[PDB]
Amino acid sequence: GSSKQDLMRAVLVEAMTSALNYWERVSGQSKFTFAEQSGLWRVYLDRSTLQTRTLDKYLRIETLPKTPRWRTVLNSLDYILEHCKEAGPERTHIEMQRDKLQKLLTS
Amino acid sequence: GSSKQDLMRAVLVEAMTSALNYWERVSGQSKFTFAEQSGLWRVYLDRSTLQTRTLDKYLRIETLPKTPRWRTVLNSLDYILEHCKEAGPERTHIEMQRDKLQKLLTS
């Protein structure tokens, strides 16, 4: 129902933002670099500056697309966890949010 | 010194035992299957029965070899975490023990 759909969207934003913050700290690379190196998100020239325009929409519930690319988000969480291994609460939180999303998508 | 060497051996046994218990529960497969499918540990015919004779020595501090194969143990932890994703305290403990071993080996 509407509650499950809104929960999925809230978890997707939490998971993506958490994963990017972890990527930035552990890899020492930018959000731009995650998109460019993984090939999972496109780079655009906006306001005369390179931007991960679509990825950026997934970092706030207000801008999340009407049709989220759930598999691309799960591939993003997997890519970040594949390249960033530092064990700890921050990583555990991303793993837990990944499992939550997967269970919501398959229930 | 002796303290660091004994700590490394104690952490190796904790990590291996933890990882195998997690593999068995999450994969629903045996220790034998972890060895056979990964190819990381040999199978032997002892007492007329198939056994992971060398791997078994890593599950008790009393039997741990004088010369542990540290890389084979780290490859074992990586293989189990690659195939078993269930997020939770049990998985976090294995990740934490893996990081502890790596830091001891590089300090």
Distances (CA, A) of B93 to A22, A40, B50: 19, 30, 30
* Residue count of chain B: 107
Which element (helix H / strand E) includes A51? Answer: strand A49-51
Instruction: Tally helices (H) and strands (E) across chain A.
Output: 5, 2
Q: Are A15 and A97 in contact (CB under 8 A)?
A: yes
Burial of B6 (0-12, 13-18, 19+ CB in 10 A): exposed
Q: Are A65 and A16 in contact (CB under 8 A)?
A: no
Method: X-ray
Backbone angles phi, psi at B57, to 5 degrees: -65, -25
Q: Which amino acid is at B99?
A: D
Q: Which amino acid is at B60?
A: R
Distance (Å, rounded) from C-alpha A20 to C-alpha A39?
15
Distances (CA, A) of B103 to A39, B8, B34, B66: 32, 10, 26, 21
Instruction: Test B95 with A96 for CB contact under 8 angstroms.
Output: no
User: Tokens 């009407």 belong to which residue?
Assistant: A66
Q: Is A46 helix (H, G, I), strand (E, B) or coil?
A: strand
Choose among A86, A75, A88: nearest CA to A40: A75
Q: Please give the torsion angle defined by the CA atoms of residues A59, A76, B98 and B44, in that order, rounded to the nearest 10 degrees.
A: 160
Distances (CA, A) of B61 to A89, B6, B10, B86: 29, 10, 7, 28
Distance (Å, rounded) from C-alpha A13 to C-alpha A25?
18
The B residues from 51 to 90 touching A (CB cutoff 8 Å) are 85-88
Distance (Å, rounded) from C-alpha B49 to C-alpha A54?
58
Distances (CA, A) of B86 to B1, B23, B82, B89: 37, 10, 11, 10
Distance (Å, rounded) from C-alpha B67 to C-alpha B12?
12
Q: Which amino acid is at B16?
A: M
Sign of the CA dihedral A10, A12, A18, A21? negative
Instruction: Tally helices (H) and strands (E) across chain B.
Output: 5, 2
Distance (Å, rounded) from C-alpha B61 to C-alpha B77?
18
Preceding residues of all breaks in chain B (C to N beyond 2.5 angstroms)? none
Q: Which amino acid is at B102?
A: Q
Mutation pick from B11, B82, B91, B97 vs chain A, by most beta carbons of A within 10 Å, is B91
Q: Which chain A residues are within 8 Å of B85, Cβ to Cβ? A: 95, 98-99
